[PDB]
Write an enzyme that holds these catalytic residues in place. Structure first.
Site, short mmCIF file in Angstrom:
data_model
loop_
_atom_site.label_atom_id
_atom_site.label_comp_id
_atom_site.label_asym_id
_atom_site.label_seq_id
_atom_site.Cartn_x
_atom_site.Cartn_y
_atom_site.Cartn_z
N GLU E 158 -9.77 -2.49 -8.25
CA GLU E 158 -8.75 -3.16 -9.05
C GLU E 158 -9.22 -3.40 -10.48
O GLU E 158 -8.41 -3.33 -11.41
CB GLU E 158 -8.34 -4.48 -8.40
CG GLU E 158 -7.09 -5.09 -8.99
CD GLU E 158 -7.07 -6.59 -8.85
OE1 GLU E 158 -7.91 -7.26 -9.49
OE2 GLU E 158 -6.21 -7.11 -8.11
N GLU E 161 -8.79 -0.13 -12.13
CA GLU E 161 -7.36 0.09 -12.31
C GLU E 161 -6.83 -0.70 -13.49
O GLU E 161 -6.01 -0.19 -14.27
CB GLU E 161 -6.62 -0.28 -11.03
CG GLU E 161 -5.14 0.08 -11.02
CD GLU E 161 -4.91 1.57 -10.84
OE1 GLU E 161 -5.80 2.25 -10.28
OE2 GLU E 161 -3.84 2.06 -11.24
N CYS E 178 -2.98 -7.54 -2.09
CA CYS E 178 -3.78 -8.07 -1.00
C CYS E 178 -2.96 -8.80 0.06
O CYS E 178 -3.48 -9.03 1.16
CB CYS E 178 -4.86 -9.01 -1.53
SG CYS E 178 -6.26 -8.17 -2.30
N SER E 198 -0.21 -2.69 -7.77
CA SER E 198 -1.29 -1.72 -7.81
C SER E 198 -1.37 -0.93 -6.51
O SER E 198 -0.93 -1.38 -5.45
CB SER E 198 -2.62 -2.40 -8.08
OG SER E 198 -3.66 -1.45 -8.24
N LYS E 237 -1.02 -9.23 9.38
CA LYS E 237 -1.74 -7.97 9.28
C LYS E 237 -1.34 -6.98 10.37
O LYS E 237 -1.66 -5.79 10.25
CB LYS E 237 -3.24 -8.22 9.34
CG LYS E 237 -3.75 -9.15 8.25
CD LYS E 237 -3.30 -8.72 6.88
CE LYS E 237 -4.12 -9.40 5.80
NZ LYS E 237 -4.00 -8.69 4.50
N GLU E 240 0.92 -4.76 8.83
CA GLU E 240 0.20 -3.96 7.84
C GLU E 240 -0.56 -2.82 8.50
O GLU E 240 -0.75 -1.77 7.89
CB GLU E 240 -0.75 -4.85 7.04
CG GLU E 240 -1.13 -4.29 5.69
CD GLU E 240 -2.31 -3.35 5.76
OE1 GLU E 240 -3.11 -3.46 6.72
OE2 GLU E 240 -2.44 -2.50 4.86
N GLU E 245 2.26 5.36 7.09
CA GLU E 245 1.43 5.82 5.99
C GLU E 245 0.11 5.07 5.90
O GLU E 245 -0.57 5.14 4.88
CB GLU E 245 2.19 5.68 4.67
CG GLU E 245 2.68 4.27 4.38
CD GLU E 245 1.76 3.50 3.45
OE1 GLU E 245 0.99 4.15 2.71
OE2 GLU E 245 1.80 2.26 3.47
N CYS E 382 -4.61 -17.83 2.16
CA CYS E 382 -4.74 -17.43 3.55
C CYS E 382 -5.42 -18.47 4.42
O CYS E 382 -5.35 -18.36 5.65
CB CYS E 382 -5.49 -16.10 3.67
SG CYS E 382 -4.53 -14.61 3.25
N1 402 Z 1 -6.92 -8.47 4.14
C1 402 Z 1 -6.98 -9.38 3.52
FE1 402 Z 1 -7.36 -10.97 2.57
C2 402 Z 1 -9.13 -10.69 2.68
O1 402 Z 1 -10.30 -10.45 2.65
C3 402 Z 1 -7.39 -11.90 4.33
O2 402 Z 1 -8.06 -11.72 5.31
FE2 402 Z 1 -6.32 -13.15 3.39
C4 402 Z 1 -7.50 -14.25 4.18
N2 402 Z 1 -8.32 -14.95 4.72
C5 402 Z 1 -5.29 -13.07 4.73
O3 402 Z 1 -4.46 -12.85 5.57
S1 402 Z 1 -5.12 -11.47 2.39
C6 402 Z 1 -4.75 -11.88 0.58
N3 402 Z 1 -5.98 -11.91 -0.29
C7 402 Z 1 -6.91 -13.05 0.00
S2 402 Z 1 -7.74 -13.01 1.59
S1 SF4 Z 2 -1.32 -15.41 2.75
FE1 SF4 Z 2 -0.18 -15.32 4.72
S2 SF4 Z 2 1.35 -13.67 4.41
FE2 SF4 Z 2 -0.20 -13.43 2.75
S3 SF4 Z 2 -1.71 -11.95 3.60
FE3 SF4 Z 2 -2.50 -14.02 4.11
S4 SF4 Z 2 -1.66 -14.43 6.19
FE4 SF4 Z 2 -0.46 -12.67 5.36
#
Ligand code: 402
Ligand code: SF4
Ligand code: SF4
Ligand code: SF4
Ligand code: SF4
Ligand code: SF4
Ligand code: SF4
Ligand code: SF4
Ligand code: SF4
Ligand code: SF4
Ligand code: SF4
Ligand code: SF4
Ligand code: SF4
Ligand code: SF4
Ligand code: SF4
Ligand code: SF4
Ligand code: SF4
Ligand code: SF4
Ligand code: SF4
Ligand code: SF4
Ligand code: SF4
Lengths: 180, 183, 186, 174, 448, 183, 174
Positions: E158, E161, E178, E198, E237, E240, E245, E382
């Site tokens: 990133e 980028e 993320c 991104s 996740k 995800e 893809e 998170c």
């Molecule tokens: N993949 C990813 Fe991430 C990382 O590393 C996680 O695990 Fe998060 C956490 N804890 C979650 O859900 S997502 C967003 N970015 C910050 S942290």
């Molecule tokens: S903050 Fe919540 S919605 Fe966003 S990645 Fe983390 S767990 Fe998933």
């Protein structure tokens, strides 16, 4: 839905009255704007005297007393009993066996039919009504003026100002529209 | 001697969110290894106030702490005692009868198995399995612990701890003031 | 049947010198010492006379007099029987209120009054009370004696007394004696 | 929970037929002929007393020969193993256990009937599990005062009382 | 489905409707609701706000044994079951563990090491890396790796980028990639701005891609029997990890993810205690990371982690930018200004998903130009996701523990890790070097 | 069925002498050995009407004998019943469920211990000492006894027993005479 | 301000039509069937009396449950929340509130009609705001004795009387 012109029967004044009917049953009563007597407004009995015709206790069949208790019985044999009773009493003691009490709350045709069928059928002058208890009034007015009834007409007493002389004042609660 | 306080609900501000019973269960059973986190709860959940919903809305029902309490009078063993400002049931002297259920008209008490140290409790001589010991459960107004936990956990603050002495004085004063301003 | 009639609309008035299962289910317990039920019923009649709850049509149309019993019940007052029997006085008023404004009242009595030497006065007073309230000849009201054996009533319609004949006829009348002489036998 | 039976004292005439029906029904099957439902006269009300089946059962905790056990939804006294060690009598709060002795019967109509008709172990209302019909004490009462209660009826009564209370409080004032 | 609402336990309290940003909860003031699963972003905050818990002392409902099959949970959990339930994947993990023919690897997120300690009656927010790794190796997992390796990888990617996009600016107000719920929402409602976001993959996906094709080269295991499970604090996740893809080297990078609560259920089911176990270290080849990758659990830590190397990428002079306290908070949108390389950057960090709508408009974006924006759908980052345990109704203990862990390590910038240098000198060459475009880059083209 | 009477005060002619409560206490407790003489009273004093004093004078307040009475409806046990013309509580079946104190807006019901035959009345099984039975006290309009005793004991003649039918007719006639003399 | 209805006693026969109409309209609507307009006999004249809608009410200041409230341009009882505390009956000067009890009816033609036809709460003239027509009492009267006064009719009458007085004083003698 449907409106029928009728004269209110509760007192002697007489008023136009539309019997607002719906689904064969009376649902309301209305005044007549073109009537010369009430002029489009009625007392308590005109507005709420229609709740007397469809009570759940209305007499709906002929009954006769056989052994002291009334029993539902059809029309023809009841008429047989009436006919044979009148025949036997007339054969026994003549035509003076009954006195006819014609209602004062029935149309003129009822009284005429009652008189004829008590005079041209058996034959007697025994007819009476329970409205005699004004009897001297018709006697007195006939002996004085030769007229046995009302002289003037009601709506003329309010067309222009007059002098109104009341004797034994109860018109305010016997004819709530003449006093109006 | 002072009148026993009790909690009361406000039906106009209750949504039936069921976040008041969970707090009560989590605050009474600290001896069964609960750490303010689901996952450490290894026992069946047992609250003391019971939510009920009818066509005119919903509210919880709990013990009213009756002065002439029928639940205490019926119990021949005398397990129910007034320990402080609240009437409390004893979990050591209950013989598990059900005459205690037939007395209370509000139905705020229920017969359920006892759980100590995160496990079921088992009796000594019945039947070939052992029949777990079963005790009465009812609201004790959290007398051993601090302030009531049903209040302070309701998001809408529908539950209020009412004292039945000051309320009468306040209503008397309000009635007098309302009557004097007109007549 | 008595306790089944308590469909949240019945009224029980029980008088008993002893204690049984009936007195514990009645709202009014007019406990009276034995032999003192005559002043109790006299005060009962006096109270129901004083309140003016007497159905005058029945006594006027069928009975021969009204002042005869009033001459005997006005001597006894609610207070007179209050210190005569040692019972509360408001209970008599409540019993009169429950007995008078009601329409049907049924009076029962067990073996206790029947095995008494002065039971004739008791049953006469009960009959007088039933007559004065107009609760006779109606469904659900009237004097209701009890018999201690299965076939006592069938021992009265037929001859089982030295002064009775079958058909509620007295043997002292010679007409009943000559009524059955050949069909009966000897 | 266990099943038991209660009698509301509002409709108990003291007619002594529930006790005799309990006695003779148990007699005809071969058990102890003595009745297992008792009558008590009090200052305020006459009510029959019996074995409300204690769900924790203090009876079986003092029996030394292990002769009391839970079967079905009731407590069974197992008359073949009882020896007469009157220890379960000291622990029964309601006093619903008496012993098969002729002197234990009080002077009443039932004693006269039993005398005109003609081992000591503890006897107790076993809820009549040996009969396909219900209890004999509930279907012989001339006033139907006695009534049997189970867990479902208890839950229904609790819910009914709670709903009635809530509806009253809503209808009057919050 | 993933997020459901049971109709036998829901009571219509409408509380969970007051926290999800999409408002996919459809119902009335009473009666059970239902999740609009075609628009839900799977954030998870409608689960933790639920408080209907119907017990099993009544037989008017399902017998509580078939319920553990519908929810997908283990059959030996005996915890209370709520209404708004997540979908469970612990059983499939257990079945994979039963098979001894799978070279099993597991991943650790930078919010599990703090979250899991509350599941065994310990203090809320007790930093336990060693106990966690010891228990994971005691759960018959052959290898344990940290997802912070992919976090360092995505920080470097990133930063490169952003340096590429700051010259000859094309859609310069670019967003972080993320949080997959953010990507789902952007593709759901605002499809015209998806090229702003991104093309860098989430750290778990880079970690899985490196495991499948580079972890199979440092070892003697063919890339066909590897079973990879990532422990993420997120009800987010799973969506995800199963996009069409979202696979590289032929196979899925991450098979199926499990939250913290499912890991606790697996821990309790195996009958292994937590406090007695000693400390241990992760595997060296793909488990050595820096403190800059540790702060992603808290909100805004991506900003410091990216800037600590973007400053060196722009100015080419090592000057301290280790700590900033002006972008750390817990609610709303936060703004700052950074002077780097005779260039001024207006930076914003957003906690939540609704709080991007004011700054996502085509008119508001033009009036601020939003040179770099970081986004998290879950409030406070998170550390308050869907995978975090219930709290029987706190957050600051976890973030303070994460910051203490960042401050304890002797490596702060996300550039001095020898593992990253070795990976770039052996397998990938240079960033944006016609190899990362196949393994570390994705094209956001559902066009929903 | 007709309207029930209720006693009402008069703030213009009330002083605060508390000589109307003592008459009520002495007339209700004839079974506790009272002989209209201080010294024979061996029990604590409990009146039925309560005197309240504020800035705008003082007055007594008591039960207004509502027709759709909230207190009668909320009582689940059934103690409060409309036995006579007035509304009366029953001392046999009351259990002290304090919902009455949440129903009446005036506050004319107070929970106090019962005293029968000159001694405190205790319960069967409670707490180790016993506890007294608590009953709800409110005005019963002297239905069992004769005319009200709070009236005929007020020196200033402030309390009045009003029937809400004659008063309406009197007010109507006053208004009609006042308006018809002007037109 | 508020709209109300007034009846000059010059043209009131005491014919009981307005009272019966007010009762029966409220009956057929679904409210209490009792009239809210009382006929009073005096030494000099007969006039119906109803609730002159007081702008300060002396009614909502004594209601403890807060049932009486001002709606539209009238004072509304809100019967559903009324409990029966006879306090507003004390504070009404004209006596315009009666309670829904059978004994509250005086012996007249209306009683005969209502007994040949076939909750206790305070009923007050609500000015028939639920009906698209005007008040029933002013509409069914045989002599049109009652009349409804608005907020503007009072101003018109005041201005008319004031102008007449001024013009008379000017014309006759300054
Ligand atoms: N993949 C990813 Fe991430 C990382 O590393 C996680 O695990 Fe998060 C956490 N804890 C979650 O859900 S997502 C967003 N970015 C910050 S942290
Ligand atoms: S903050 Fe919540 S919605 Fe966003 S990645 Fe983390 S767990 Fe998933
Ligand atoms: S005056 Fe009245 S009662 Fe007489 S006819 Fe007219 S409407 Fe009927
Ligand atoms: S349930 Fe317990 S407290 Fe209640 S009566 Fe039975 S033994 Fe006593
Ligand atoms: S359990 Fe029931 S009866 Fe006992 S004090 Fe509580 S509410 Fe009253
Ligand atoms: S007061 Fe305490 S015990 Fe009672 S319901 Fe509330 S939290 Fe539970
Ligand atoms: S917490 Fe409050 S709002 Fe929720 S169910 Fe309980 S009382 Fe009702
Ligand atoms: S059978 Fe019924 S009425 Fe007869 S004694 Fe037994 S309980 Fe009482
Ligand atoms: S008497 Fe029988 S039942 Fe009782 S304790 Fe002894 S052996 Fe057991
Ligand atoms: S005998 Fe007594 S103690 Fe034993 S179960 Fe029966 S009632 Fe309970
Ligand atoms: S259930 Fe059977 S043993 Fe028990 S009292 Fe009734 S008849 Fe007797
Ligand atoms: S997952 Fe998030 S967005 Fe979807 S319904 Fe639940 S709280 Fe709302
Ligand atoms: S929080 Fe739970 S119980 Fe409340 S509406 Fe949402 S799903 Fe239903
Ligand atoms: S305190 Fe007494 S009168 Fe009041 S509701 Fe409870 S039982 Fe009824
Ligand atoms: S106690 Fe209160 S609510 Fe009950 S009748 Fe008296 S004034 Fe009305
Ligand atoms: S009316 Fe009688 S009972 Fe009521 S307060 Fe006055 S004296 Fe006491
Ligand atoms: S006796 Fe009369 S003046 Fe004295 S306090 Fe009572 S009401 Fe007031
Ligand atoms: S309708 Fe008119 S005339 Fe008849 S009573 Fe009413 S105000 Fe008087
Ligand atoms: S009677 Fe009705 S309107 Fe009058 S004060 Fe009481 S509650 Fe209010
Ligand atoms: S009821 Fe009487 S005091 Fe109240 S607003 Fe109407 S006229 Fe005025
Ligand atoms: S306005 Fe309507 S409610 Fe009021 S008195 Fe006239 S008819 Fe009756």
């Amino acid at each position: 839905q449907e409106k029928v012109l009728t004269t209110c029967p509760y007192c002697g004044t007489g008023c136009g009255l539309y019997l607002k009917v719906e689904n064969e049953k009376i649902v309301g009563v209305e005044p007549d704007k073109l009537h010369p007597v009430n002029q489009g407004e009625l007392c308590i009995k005109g507005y709420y005297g229609y709740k007397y015709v469809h009570d759940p206790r209305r007499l709906t069949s002929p009954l006769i007393k056989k052994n002291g208790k009334f029993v539902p019985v059809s029309w023809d044999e009841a008429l047989n009993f009436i006919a044979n009773g009148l025949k036997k009493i007339k054969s026994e003691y003549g035509s003076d066996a009954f006195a006819m009490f014609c209602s004062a709350r029935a149309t003129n045709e009822d009284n005429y039919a009652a008189q004829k069928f008590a005079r041209a059928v058996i034959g007697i002058n025994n007819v009476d009504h329970c409205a005699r208890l004004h009897a001297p009034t018709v006697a007195g007015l006939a002996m004085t003026l030769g007229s046995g009834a009302m002289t003037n007409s009601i709506p003329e007493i309010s067309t222009y100002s007059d002098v109104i002389f009341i004797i034994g004042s109860n018109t305010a609660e016997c004819h709530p529209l003449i006093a109006a | 001697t002072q009148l026993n306080p009790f909690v009361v609900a406000n039906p106009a501000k209750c949504i039936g969110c069921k976040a008041c019973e969970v707090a009560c269960f989590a605050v009474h059973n600290r001896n069964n290894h609960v750490g303010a986190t689901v996952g450490t709860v290894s026992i069946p959940v047992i609250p003391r106030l019971h939510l009920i919903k009818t066509e005119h809305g919903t509210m919880p029902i709990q013990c009213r702490h009756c002065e002439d309490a029928p639940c205490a009078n019926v119990c021949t063993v005398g397990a129910i005692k007034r320990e402080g400002n609240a009437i409390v049931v004893d979990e050591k002297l209950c013989i598990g009868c059900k005459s205690c259920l037939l007395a209370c008209p509000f139905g705020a008490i229920e017969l359920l198995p006892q759980y100590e140290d995160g496990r079921e409790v088992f009796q000594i001589n019945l039947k070939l399995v052992q029949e777990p010991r079963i005790i009465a459960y009812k609201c004790d107004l959290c007398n051993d612990l601090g302030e009531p936990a049903c209040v302070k956990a309701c998001p809408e603050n529908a539950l209020t701890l009412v004292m039945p002495t000051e309320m009468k004085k306040a209503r008397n004063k309000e009635a007098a003031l309302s009557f004097l301003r007109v007549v | 049947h008595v306790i089944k009639a308590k469909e949240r609309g019945a009224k029980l008035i029980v008088a008993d010198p002893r204690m049984n299962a009936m007195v514990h289910k009645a709202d009014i317990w007019l406990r009276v010492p034995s032999g003192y039920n005559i002043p109790l019923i006299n005060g009962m009649i006096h109270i129901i006379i004083k309140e003016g709850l007497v159905k005058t049509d029945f006594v006027k149309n069928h009975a021969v007099g009204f002042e005869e019993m009033a001459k005997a019940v006005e001597k006894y007052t609610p207070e007179y029987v209050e210190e005569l029997t040692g019972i509360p006085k408001k209970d008599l008023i409540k019993a009169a209120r429950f007995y008078g404004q009601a329409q049907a009242a049924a009076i029962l009595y067990s073996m206790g009054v029947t095995q008494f030497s002065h039971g004739t006065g008791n049953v006469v007073s009960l009959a007088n009370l039933a007559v004065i309230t107009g609760n006779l000849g109606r469904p659900g009201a009237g004097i209701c004696p009890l018999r201690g054996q299965n076939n006592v009533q069938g021992a009265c319609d037929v001859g089982a007394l030295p002064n009775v004949l079958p058909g509620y006829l007295d043997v002292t009348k010679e007409q009943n004696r000559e009524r059955f002489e050949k069909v009966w036998g000897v | 929970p266990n099943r038991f039976v209660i009698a509301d004292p509002k409709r108990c005439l003291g007619c002594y037929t529930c006790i005799a029906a309990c006695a003779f029904v148990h007699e005809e099957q071969g058990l102890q002929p003595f009745p297992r439902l008792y009558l008590t006269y009090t200052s305020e009300g006459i009510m029959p007393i019996q074995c409300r089946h204690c769900e924790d059962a203090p009876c079986a905790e003092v029996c030394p020969v292990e002769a009391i056990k839970k079967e079905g939804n009731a407590i069974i006294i197992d008359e073949k193993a009882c020896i007469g060690c009157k220890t379960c009598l000291l622990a029964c709060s309601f006093g619903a256990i008496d012993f098969s002795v002729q002197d234990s019967l009080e002077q009443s109509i039932f004693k006269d009937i039993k005398e005109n008709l003609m081992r000591i172990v503890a006897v107790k209302c076993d809820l009549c599990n040996f009969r396909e019909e219900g209890p004999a004490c509930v279907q012989f009462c001339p006033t139907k005062a006695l009534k049997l209660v189970d867990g479902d009826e208890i839950n229904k009564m609790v819910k009914n009382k709670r709903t009635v209370n809530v509806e009253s409080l809503l209808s009057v004032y919050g | 489905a993933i997020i459901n609402i049971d109709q036998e336990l829901c009571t219509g309290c409408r509380r969970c409707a007051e926290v999800c940003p999409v408002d996919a909860i459809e119902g009335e003031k009473g009666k059970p609701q239902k999740i609009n699963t075609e628009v839900c972003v799977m954030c998870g905050q409608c689960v933790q706000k639920c408080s209907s818990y119907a017990s099993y002392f009544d037989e008017s409902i399902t017998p509580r044994n078939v319920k553990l099959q519908e929810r997908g949970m283990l059959d030996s959990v005996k915890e209370p079951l709520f209404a708004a339930y997540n979908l469970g994947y612990a059983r499939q993990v257990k079945e994979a563990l039963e098979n001894p023919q799978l070279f099993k690897v597991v991943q650790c997120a930078p919010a599990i090491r703090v979250s899991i300690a509350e599941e065994f009656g310990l203090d809320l927010g007790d930093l336990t890396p060693g106990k966690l790794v010891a228990a994971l190796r005691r759960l018959n997992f052959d290898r344990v790796y940290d997802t912070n390796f992919g976090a360092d990888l995505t920080i470097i990617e990133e930063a490169n980028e952003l340096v590429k996009r700051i010259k000859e600016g094309k859609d310069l107000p670019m967003f972080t990639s993320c949080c997959p719920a953010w990507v789902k929402f952007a593709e759901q409602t605002y499809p015209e701005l998806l090229k702003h976001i991104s093309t860098c993959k989430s750290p778990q996906q880079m970690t899985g891609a490196i495991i499948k094709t580079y972890g199979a080269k440092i070892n003697n295991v063919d890339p066909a029997k590897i079973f990879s499970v990532s422990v993420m604090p997120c009800t987010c996740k799973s969506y995800e990890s199963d996009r069409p893809e979202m696979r590289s080297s032929g196979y899925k990078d991450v098979d199926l993810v499990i939250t913290t609560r499912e890991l606790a259920h697996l821990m309790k089911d195996k009958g292994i205690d937590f406090a007695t176990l000693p400390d241990e270290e992760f595997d060296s080849p793909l488990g050595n990371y820096t403190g800059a990758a540790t702060i992603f659990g808290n909100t805004g830590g991506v900003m410091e982690a990216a800037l600590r190397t973007a400053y060196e990428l722009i100015t080419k002079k090592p000057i301290p930018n280790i700590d900033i306290e002006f972008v750390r908070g817990g609610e709303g949108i936060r703004t700052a200004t950074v002077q780097v390389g005779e260039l001024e950057l207006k930076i914003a960090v957003v906690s939540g998903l609704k709080n991007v709508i004011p700054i996502l408009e085509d008119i508001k974006k033009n009036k601020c130009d939003l040179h770099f924006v970081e986004v998290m759908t879950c409030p406070e980052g998170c550390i308050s996701g869907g995978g975090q345990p219930k709290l029987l109704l706190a957050y600051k203990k976890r973030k303070e523990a994460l910051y203490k862990h960042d401050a304890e390590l002797e490596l702060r910038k996300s550039h001095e890790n020898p593992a990253i240098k070795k990976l770039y000198e052996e397998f990938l060459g240079e960033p944006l070097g016609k190899q990362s475009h196949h393994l570390l880059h994705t094209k956001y083209t559902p066009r929903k």
